[PDB]
Amino acid sequence: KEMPQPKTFGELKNLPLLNTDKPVQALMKIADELGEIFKFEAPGRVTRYLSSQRLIKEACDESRFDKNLSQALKFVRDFFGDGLVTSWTHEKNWKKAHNILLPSFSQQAMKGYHAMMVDIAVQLVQKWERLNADEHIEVPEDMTRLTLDTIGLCGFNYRFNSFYRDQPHPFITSMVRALDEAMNKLQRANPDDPAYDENKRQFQEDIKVMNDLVDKIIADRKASSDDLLTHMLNGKDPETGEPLDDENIRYQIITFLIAGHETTSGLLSFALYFLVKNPHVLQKAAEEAARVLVDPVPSYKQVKQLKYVGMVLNEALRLWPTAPAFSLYAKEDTVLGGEYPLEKGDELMVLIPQLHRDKTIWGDDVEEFRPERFENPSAIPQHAFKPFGNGQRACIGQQFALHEATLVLGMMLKHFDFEDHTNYELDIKETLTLKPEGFVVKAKSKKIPL
Numbered sequence: 259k260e261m262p263q264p265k266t267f268g269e270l271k272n273l274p275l276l277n278t279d280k281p282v283q284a285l286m287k288i289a290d291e292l293g294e295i296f297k298f299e300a301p302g303r304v305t306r307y308l309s310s311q312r313l314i315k316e317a318c319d320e321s322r323f324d325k326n327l328s329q330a331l332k333f334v335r336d337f338f339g340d341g342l343v344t345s346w347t348h349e350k351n352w353k354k355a356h357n358i359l360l361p362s363f364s365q366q367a368m369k370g371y372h373a374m375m376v377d378i379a380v381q382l383v384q385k386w387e388r389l390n391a392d393e394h395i396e397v398p399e400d401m402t403r404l405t406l407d408t409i410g411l412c413g414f415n416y417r418f419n420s421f422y423r424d425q426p427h428p429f430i431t432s433m434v435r436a437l438d439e440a441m442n443k444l445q446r447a448n449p450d451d452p453a454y455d456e457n458k459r460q461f462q463e464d465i466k467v468m469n470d471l472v473d474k475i476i477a478d479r480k481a482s483s484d485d486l487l488t489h490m491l492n493g494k495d496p497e498t499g500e501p502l503d504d505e506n507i508r509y510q511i512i513t514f515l516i517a518g519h520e521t522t523s524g525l526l527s528f529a530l531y532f533l534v535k536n537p538h539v540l541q542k543a544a545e546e547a548a549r550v551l552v553d554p555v556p557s558y559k560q561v562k563q564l565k566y567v568g569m570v571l572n573e574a575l576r577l578w579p580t581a582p583a584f585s586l587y588a589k590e591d592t593v594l595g596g597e598y599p600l601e602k603g604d605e606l607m608v609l610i611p612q613l614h615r616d617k618t619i620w621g622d623d624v625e626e627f628r629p630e631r632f633e634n635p636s637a638i639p640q641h642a643f644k645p646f647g648n649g650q651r652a653c654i655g656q657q658f659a660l661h662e663a664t665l666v667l668g669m670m671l672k673h674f675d676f677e678d679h680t681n682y683e684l685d686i687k688e689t690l691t692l693k694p695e696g697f698v699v700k701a702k703s704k705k706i707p708l
């Protein structure tokens with residue numbers, strides 16, 4: 259078959275279609291019009307957008323396709339380096355860091371992180387317990403305070419103290435602006451035009467703010483734990499026996515500070531959004547939290563018991579996966595779906611929110627929020643649900659994210675009743691990652707002691 263392709267702009271091919279603040283949402287509307295696969299061309303490059311489980315299940319065969327750096331990831335690599343997110347599977351520092359840092363996500367490590375996650379969660383709850391009755395909550399802003407602080411503490415034994423700040427933390431502000439710039443660069447035909455000189459200076463300034471904080475964290479540890487930073491500094495790869503060098507360490511710290519909170523803030527924000535928009539689901543979730551979290555602070559085992567909360571989080575990741583794309587390349591010539599021949603090196607993009615709206619998998623109710631879809635993972639076809647990527651390049655933090663989000667959402671639902679007081683209209687801000695923008699609620703304390 260000849261694959262469909264959205265509208266073109268002469269020598270610019272499809273590139274001007276990314277001239278939007280909301281490119282993933284634009285691509286989804288394209289996929290709506292064109293179907294399970296379309297070509298996307300730009301000067302000097304081509305990729306193919308996949309949206310069906312039918313095709314994506316083939317793309318997830320690691321014998322045929324390896325992780326690719328998308329254009330977006332290539333631009334992020336300017337500050338993520340060859341850390342785990344942005345390294346090719348075949349670069350020595352991928353498997354070496356993977357082997358050295360994977361012990362930081364063992365169940366043993368997770369049990370040990372639990373107390374420090376509670377420390378941040380309690381801070382969130384006390385903030386909300388302390389608001390006057392006229393006040394409201396800025397949801398993605400507070401979920402970023404929580405999630406940044408959690409990775410800072412658990413990962414690095416470092417306190418960002420975001421709840422002691424009325425503006426976002428400076429690290430956040432620079433992070434957002436760096437991700438924004440990377441996103442905006444996707445549409446630039448002439449990236450070296452002098453009209454982009456200020457963007458470039460701004461980008462280098464934001465990358466410096468981030469690296470200055472890495473330096474503080476590294477200096478704090480040298481002056482001072484068994485955590486992610488301990489493994490980075492002292493850990494030895496069993497295969498090669500070497501430790502990470504200093505350059506890679508720095509890339510890994512910035513990688514983990516960003517990738518280990520931004521998307522979890524998004525998830526928590528979407529989940530609360532869907533709960534306030536779906537009162538019967540909120541009741542059921544709140545019923546579980548009340549039944550399970552019987553102690554003044556949750557235990558590790560209790561968070562593991564919050565099954566339905568877990569399902570709410572998975573359903574929120576189904577509709578709005580917060581890292582909404584990943585990319586693959588063909589390891590050899592191969593044919594996709596019996597219909598689309600690919601050559602070695604051809605690029606694919608998995609459009610995750612559109613995969614997760616495949617009516618052949620989920621049914622016709624795909625836009626509805628129904629956590630019960632997730633009651634039994636065996637009843638879901640292979641590769642239908644991919645918010646955490648695929649295979650040996652899958653998200654290393656998945657359990658850390660989901661434990662944190664399940665603990666915090668559980669406490670939220672135990673401690674407060676929530677009101678969508680403004681009848682908020684979903685507005686999804688894109689910074690490569692996805693988050694509701696301007697989402698606000700009021701929270702009425704149930705007055706249960708902490």
Ligand code: HEM
Pocket residue numbers: 325342343356513514517518519521522525579580581583584585644645646647648650651652653654655656658659
């Ligand atoms: C809901 C939250 C999260 C989502 C939706 C998310 C999603 C993803 C996805 C889609 C990938 C694959 C990227 C690709 O194939 O190019 C990825 C990889 C990665 N994630 Fe996550 N993630 C989350 C949370 C976390 C957290 C909390 C951490 C750290 C504690 C983390 C660390 C990483 C790392 C290091 C990789 C690269 C792994 C490798 O290739 O070796 N993520 N994640």
Ligand SMILES: COc1ccc2nc(SCc3ncc(C)c(OC)c3C)[nH]c2c1
Pocket residue numbers: 276281282328330331334343444516517520521580581582583584689690691
């Ligand atoms: C058109 O090209 C695009 C557009 C938006 C996109 N958003 C993404 S999200 C890709 C991604 N995945 C995983 C992690 C861990 C990560 O760092 C937090 C990022 C940026 N990729 C895109 C590619």
